[PDB]
Amino acid sequence: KYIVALDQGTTSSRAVVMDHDANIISVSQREFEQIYPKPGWVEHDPMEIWATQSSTLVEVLAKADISSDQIAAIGITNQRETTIVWEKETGKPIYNAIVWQCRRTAEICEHLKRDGLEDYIRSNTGLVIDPYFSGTKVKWILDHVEGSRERARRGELLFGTVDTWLIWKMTQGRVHVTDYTNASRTMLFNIHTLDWDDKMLEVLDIPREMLPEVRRSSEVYGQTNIIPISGIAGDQQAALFGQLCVKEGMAKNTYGTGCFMLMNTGEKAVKSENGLLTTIACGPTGEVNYALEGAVFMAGASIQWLRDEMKLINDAYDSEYFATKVQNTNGVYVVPAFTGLGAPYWDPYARGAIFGLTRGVNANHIIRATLESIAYQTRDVLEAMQADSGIRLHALRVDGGAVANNFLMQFQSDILGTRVERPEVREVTALGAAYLAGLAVGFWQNLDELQEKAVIEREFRPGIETTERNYRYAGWKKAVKRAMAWEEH
Amino acid sequence: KYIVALDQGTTSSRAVVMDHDANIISVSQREFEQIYPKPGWVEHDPMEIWATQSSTLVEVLAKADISSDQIAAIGITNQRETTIVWEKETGKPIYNAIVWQCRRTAEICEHLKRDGLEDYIRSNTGLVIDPYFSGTKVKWILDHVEGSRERARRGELLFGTVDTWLIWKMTQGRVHVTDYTNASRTMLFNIHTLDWDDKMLEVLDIPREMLPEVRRSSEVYGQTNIIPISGIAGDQQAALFGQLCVKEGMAKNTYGTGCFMLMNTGEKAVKSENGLLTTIACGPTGEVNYALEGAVFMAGASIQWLRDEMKLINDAYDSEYFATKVQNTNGVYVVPAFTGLGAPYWDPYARGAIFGLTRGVNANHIIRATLESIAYQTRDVLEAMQADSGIRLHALRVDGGAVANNFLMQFQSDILGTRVERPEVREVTALGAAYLAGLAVGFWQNLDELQEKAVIEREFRPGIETTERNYRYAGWKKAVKRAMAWEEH
Amino acid sequence: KYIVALDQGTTSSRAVVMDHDANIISVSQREFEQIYPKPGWVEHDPMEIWATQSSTLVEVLAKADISSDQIAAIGITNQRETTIVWEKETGKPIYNAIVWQCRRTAEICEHLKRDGLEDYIRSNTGLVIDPYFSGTKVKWILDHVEGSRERARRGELLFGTVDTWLIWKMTQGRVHVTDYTNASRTMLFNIHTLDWDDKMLEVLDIPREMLPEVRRSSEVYGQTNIIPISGIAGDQQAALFGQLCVKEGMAKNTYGTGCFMLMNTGEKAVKSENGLLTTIACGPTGEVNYALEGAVFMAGASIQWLRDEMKLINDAYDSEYFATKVQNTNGVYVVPAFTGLGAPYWDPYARGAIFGLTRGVNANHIIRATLESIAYQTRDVLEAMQADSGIRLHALRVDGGAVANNFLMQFQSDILGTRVERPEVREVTALGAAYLAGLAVGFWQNLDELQEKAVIEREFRPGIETTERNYRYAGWKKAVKRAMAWEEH
Amino acid sequence: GLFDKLKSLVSTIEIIAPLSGEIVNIEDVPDVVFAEKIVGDGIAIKPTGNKMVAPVDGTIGKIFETNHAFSIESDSGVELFVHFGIDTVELKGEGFKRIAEEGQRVKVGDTVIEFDLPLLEEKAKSTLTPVVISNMDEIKELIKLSGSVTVGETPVIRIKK
Numbered sequence A, B, C: 001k002y003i004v005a006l007d008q009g010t011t012s013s014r015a016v017v018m019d020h021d022a023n024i025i026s027v028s029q030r031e032f033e034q035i036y037p038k039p040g041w042v043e044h045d046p047m048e049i050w051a052t053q054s055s056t057l058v059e060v061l062a063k064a065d066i067s068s069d070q071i072a073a074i075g076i077t078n079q080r081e082t083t084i085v086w087e088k089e090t091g092k093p094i095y096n097a098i099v100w101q102c103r104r105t106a107e108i109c110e111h112l113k114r115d116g117l118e119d120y121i122r123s124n125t126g127l128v129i130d131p132y133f134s135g136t137k138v139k140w141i142l143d144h145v146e147g148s149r150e151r152a153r154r155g156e157l158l159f160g161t162v163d164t165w166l167i168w169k170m171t172q173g174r175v176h177v178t179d180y181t182n183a184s185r186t187m188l189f190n191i192h193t194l195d196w197d198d199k200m201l202e203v204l205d206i207p208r209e210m211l212p213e214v215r216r217s218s219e220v221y222g223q224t225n226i227i228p229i230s231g232i233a234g235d236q237q238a239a240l241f242g243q244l245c246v247k248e249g250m251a252k253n254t255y256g257t258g259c260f261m262l263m264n265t266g267e268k269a270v271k272s273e274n275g276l277l278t279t280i281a282c283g284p285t286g287e288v289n290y291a292l293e294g295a296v297f298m299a300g301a302s303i304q305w306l307r308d309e310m311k312l313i314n315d316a317y318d319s320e321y322f323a324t325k326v327q328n329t330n331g332v333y334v335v336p337a338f339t340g341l342g343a344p345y346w347d348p349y350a351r352g353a354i355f356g357l358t359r360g361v362n363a364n365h366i367i368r369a370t371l372e373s374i375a376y377q378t379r380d381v382l383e384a385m386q387a388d389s390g391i392r393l394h395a396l397r398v399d400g401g402a403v404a405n406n407f408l409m410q411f412q413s414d415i416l417g418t419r420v421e422r423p424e425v426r427e428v429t430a431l432g433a434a435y436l437a438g439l440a441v442g443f444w445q446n447l448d449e450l451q452e453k454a455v456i457e458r459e460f461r462p463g464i465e466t467t468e469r470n471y472r473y474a475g476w477k478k479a480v481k482r483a484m485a486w487e488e489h
Numbered sequence D: 001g002l003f004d005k006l007k008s009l010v011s012t013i014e015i016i017a018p019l020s021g022e023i024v025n026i027e028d029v030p031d032v033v034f035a036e037k038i039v040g041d042g043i044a045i046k047p048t049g050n051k052m053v054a055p056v057d058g059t060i061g062k063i064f065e066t067n068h069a070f071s072i073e074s075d076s077g078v079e080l081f082v083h084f085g086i087d088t089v090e091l092k093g094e095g096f097k098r099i100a101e102e103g104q105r106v107k108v109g110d111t112v113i114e115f116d117l118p119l120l121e122e123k124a125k126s127t128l129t130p131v132v133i134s135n136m137d138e139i140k141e142l143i144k145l146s147g148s149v150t151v152g153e154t155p156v157i158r159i160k161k
């Protein structure tokens, strides 16, 4: 018997199959196109996530040799914010999906600020005025289609996030539900009142009609034919969970397409005064918990950038090897605001920049610099995290794909002057959904059944260069401040 | 019968052999190491220019089949500013050569400004306080060697620029002479008084003892055994000359390691009020003339950068091909202040930066951006040139190695909204020395003998995109302003 | 009103939409994974062609803005030989698709020869004993699955080629048909008797049960829901057709993943005595015609090889540019038998080799050599073609993706000493299906309606180097002979 | 609302008004490339509203990405350049809207780009709309009409090739 998780990510779609004993049994990854139709814009193709996510399932099931008969449930994990609209009848999109990075609805945010909602939005969404979240991507869509708003009041138009879209495409049109995690992200939902905001909805000109049903992050949403789908949670949160976040002051950092740093704040909605997000996570039964989050748009992406456009490396894996051929970035800094600055900057205007170049700088300085950006950003977010929550981390639990980089790991450690604990199973975001699934299905009963698959594989501790950290960071600080406000309006 | 020119450049050393009819007969190039011992620093190895320059001669002579018997004279052309000191007895350097780019003596300049010499230095050198010129590189040397100053008052220590060094190493120690062009560059010499400045010399703590003999840019300096050496002029100037600069308001732009834009101001030392240099060139007989100059440190270098460190291209030639695969830099800008900013910025603090990057930007955006920097800088310099001299160019005569780039050429044209005339022989800097040599030797008698080898090979005229130029340049302007002041003090 | 063609190729899947006037209106390409599970082996994933082919349709339809309402019919084109088996009930494969290149069933062929069927197989299939065709790939499958043969006599097991598979997956399981073109390829079908061979079937242990229904290359096979599917023909043949092959002695060469050279032999099954294939094509109404075919496994693939594994180029387009930076391969030869040698060698044992290397040879020699292989092979095939058919071509009509390579085109011309006519629309293989579709649907009535969209865009004629051709080819000949028989048995 | 559907009145080289308003001396364009005919010669036009159209049956050459200008080659080997306003490229495509595509042949009159004469009215630096012939070298005589013109109707220039 086994659960099966679905991780549909920015970069790609995956499918993990675990046993009761919670062992990774078989996996399937399949990467998918990234479209930039214009600069600061990012978009993915609904049918492609779809095709890719689906396809990934089969292939896992197949790979292991397993059928409808032996799978307890389906756990679902997705990329956040990324808005989608689709004609109910058809199962067809009225547009492309707007991704969380895409800076398009930037002017809109500018109105929102012009009006006076910063305060409001903060307080009820826990979010912050920025193209990062669902809201504006919705309005921007409705706004750039003739028969939209009206077509949607009549309600032939569906909204949703990846989990919602992923679900409905499986419950053959039956189910229209998002989870609690997902919803907080949207900028339309109220975290205290725990329901859609009438104001947002209005102000934004959104129609309650498209909004799905909002439900617990562990519940049986329904059944599907590969069978029930018991789990749903925004990716970052499903990883908080798989790390066994779950308790106050508990925290992790996920290194993937982006970087997400979260801390469980039990049942208290801590109000960030330091460029951070107040949002929802889970407590041990999949119940609603609050939390502090630091979002950083670019991490692993950069590597992909060097890898795929710049063409300096064949594999991201190689970055360790070259970055280590150098000892120093030789003065260079890489601010990867390829799609604005997130926490705690939140400047959809800044753009990527490179600095401190001189004739002797080469490819390897550059790569490494990219790797460095990672820890810098991380560190930015962290200091915020601390100030906000008054707590001082002693270790950083981490996970993500980039976390296999001894170099980065370590460097991360030095630059923080803190130990870094790297978990033995990197594929945690998955694990999270599973539990939420399993649990919800009596597949497990107790989290405790599992304070055991969470072996630490490695500890990174501060080397002697940790003394140098302040200088190096000031570097960073100056660089950043120069990439800001690049675009115009 | 034939003259032979020597072009010893930043990047490499060359040897051209021309006939009376002034035809390029055989050439020899040999590139040489570039050392960056530290960031903003550049240095070349005296023995290597030396070895490389020498070696280049033979090989040309050999290549064509020619001897001591058929060569009328030796014309000499060198890279400017680049300071050298050497024990007289030995023929050995007390250091490495400091190159014109090398920002080392930057603090020194800072004293100079602190003291009050900006005004003075301007007015008598026509130069501007900046590590770019000889002066400070000399003092910095004397300052970082125990037995120096004193060893040099006793005068066992020789100073010189490439022409001076190149000469002495040929006139077996006999001759110690620099030309008029060369000397202006040093920051120690007085352009009106046409002789070494007592003040500079003092202030800088330099000893008249090391200074060579300063003589006409066409004169027989002496004889050497491959025979007489009749010509000498700083590279930029020898190209002004080969273009037949020679008359008031006449101008060229040289695209090589750097970019140098000069205009003959006959016999009048125009005082730049726009970030430009007042310096010396030649009038038709190799006599002293004045001129306005715009120096831009990085041009062809950048290409080499992409080519040699970044590793994006195998040949600089290839840049056309890739840059053209793209239509736009896609928002990107490259400010190549790898070794500070020159005219008209003159900020030894700025460093290279890249901007406007987003996930969709790739290698080709980047290359092209580098190519673009070229025309931007050019254009910066030009506008200055115009304001200063009150004249409006209608064409730009050009030359240099990079000038074989149809793309850049053209783009240069569009971005200026001016025609660009590309001469049929690109190797003009050479030609210049020759004439100065030949002439001085009765090899030619009259410049007029030659208002004929100066065929125009091509004209670039403003395409329709020339309308777009202002926007594009504003891009540039913002980018620049952000690379400034990067380093600290 | 419009027809829509489907081209499902070795490399990728496509979707073309044409108008009545036969204009390419919108296209969709989507490349798909290539698996080599072992050396001389190639395999594609049924669900991926599937997913990719499907997906491509929508996107074309969508792109142009068009619905079920305005499309006259569906024309279908596929890659040949590539065998597939699938559980009838399910719509699931019992294996991966074996591709035409895959040398797996090589021993099997060895039995076939051992037995005495060379003669037979030749005479009735017109094919030749080689892993290239369907037959053996089928048996190899049935042979490496427990419940297969039997499961298939009971007939829960389906066989098919891409057209057949592509159809059935659209006629929701309804239709099981292959066309006449497709079938000849299989090694199971009898070209005279125009029906499945009882002998082959036996000898190979294949069960009539899996074989589909074999029908005209223009007929309404059925209806599907995007509507009827009126066309089907093996790719090479659909291009013969779009070139308006159609009459005796008429010929084309297609440059794609492989190279296929075919000549219409009206109604006469010419017996190849020169390493060629006797197979079926169409006559003007989509009726059965015979033809001579020369298959060459590797062409465009090689470029992909340099492009994707070797990593020398970013785009195949770039090959022109680099190959032209060189004048000669500098002695080098590339025999691209990556997956054996086809016509007229047919040696599933040879493997890729490179020759004539010396220290001065670099990347560009190599690329170009790869490009050259193309014309060599072409030429090999051609000479055969001529001998066999007693006719001497005066021009070569061509088409394919690689045909955009001026260099290759030309070089092809020189090396043949024959003109080369390059058609103005390269996407002919598509066009072919369409007609077969349209025609069959009264969409067109007469081929004649169209001896007009067939404009020649360019003529390549023999340059002076054409004199050198014999030497150069002998090069080739020696190289080839050395790559042969590499693997063992 | 729009007669776009209805039939219109239908009447050496003549170039037709590709947009409408009052004609102007190139010489008065607030940009040198224009004013000195560096880019070539022709006239300008203060505009009246709604749209830009082919002024010769030829083939649209390039169309600016920010769709504020375009060129085209006449079946008669003439080169036309139409640049809407000046420094318009900073509006980044706002007001503009692409009716045609970077490749087609057109007759006179076919819609090429549509626009928003008022958004453009206060946003843009200037609204002048130069119409110049770029290949001034392959043209003998070139004449400049005057006064008012109307789209795809009144001609602005006549030229002898």
Ligand SMILES: Nc1ncnc2c1ncn2[C@@H]1O[C@H](COP(=O)(O)OP(=O)(O)O)[C@@H](O)[C@H]1O
Binding pocket: A009, A010, A011, A012, A255, A256, A257, A258, A299, A300, A301, A303, A304, A316, A317, A318, A319, A320, A400, A401, A402, A403, A404, A405
């Ligand atoms: N050795 C490595 N060093 C750096 N980045 C790595 C390395 N291995 C994988 N990656 C990066 O890790 C990322 C994958 O992260 P993961 O958590 O799987 O994906 P996702 O972005 O979908 O959440 C990519 O952005 C990739 O470019």
Ligand SMILES: Nc1ncnc2c1ncn2[C@@H]1O[C@H](COP(=O)(O)OP(=O)(O)O)[C@@H](O)[C@H]1O
Binding pocket: B009, B010, B011, B012, B255, B256, B257, B258, B299, B300, B301, B303, B304, B316, B317, B318, B319, B320, B400, B401, B402, B403, B404, B405
């Ligand atoms: N096609 C080209 N495009 C760009 N730069 C070129 C090209 N060909 C040569 N170069 C560049 O031209 C320069 C050579 O300029 P030249 O006037 O010979 O040398 P120098 O710097 O010694 O004065 C180099 O900096 C090189 O990188």
Ligand SMILES: Nc1ncnc2c1ncn2[C@@H]1O[C@H](COP(=O)(O)OP(=O)(O)O)[C@@H](O)[C@H]1O
Binding pocket: C009, C010, C011, C012, C255, C256, C257, C258, C299, C300, C301, C303, C304, C316, C317, C318, C319, C320, C400, C401, C402, C403, C404, C405
């Ligand atoms: N300029 C070019 N030179 C060489 N090969 C090219 C070029 N452009 C495309 N290709 C090659 O053409 C092929 C595409 O051929 P085509 O007829 O479309 O595809 P298929 O193999 O599916 O039949 C590829 O094998 C590719 O590697």
Ligand SMILES: O=C[C@@H](O)COP(=O)(O)O
Binding pocket: A008, A009, A010, A011, A078, A079, A080, A081, A100, A234, A235, A236, A256, A257, A258
């Ligand atoms: O806010 C978006 C997050 O879900 C990012 O997750 P991801 O890195 O896996 O795409």
Ligand SMILES: O=C[C@@H](O)COP(=O)(O)O
Binding pocket: B008, B009, B010, B011, B078, B079, B080, B081, B100, B234, B235, B236, B256, B257, B258
């Ligand atoms: O100021 C230094 C100049 O001589 C530069 O000349 P160069 O580009 O040939 O090295």
Ligand SMILES: O=C[C@@H](O)COP(=O)(O)O
Binding pocket: C008, C009, C010, C011, C078, C079, C080, C081, C100, C234, C235, C236, C256, C257, C258
């Ligand atoms: O024999 C196989 C042929 O169909 C090859 O066609 P292809 O090059 O398009 O894959």
Ligand SMILES: [Zn+2]
Binding pocket: A007, A008, A009, A010, A235, A256, A429
């Ligand atoms: Zn993920």
Ligand SMILES: [Zn+2]
Binding pocket: B007, B008, B009, B010, B235, B256, B429
């Ligand atoms: Zn030079």
Ligand SMILES: [Zn+2]
Binding pocket: C007, C008, C009, C010, C235, C256, C429
């Ligand atoms: Zn094909």
Ligand SMILES: [Zn+2]
Binding pocket: B467, B468, D068, D069, D083, D086, D087, D088, D089
């Ligand atoms: Zn413009």
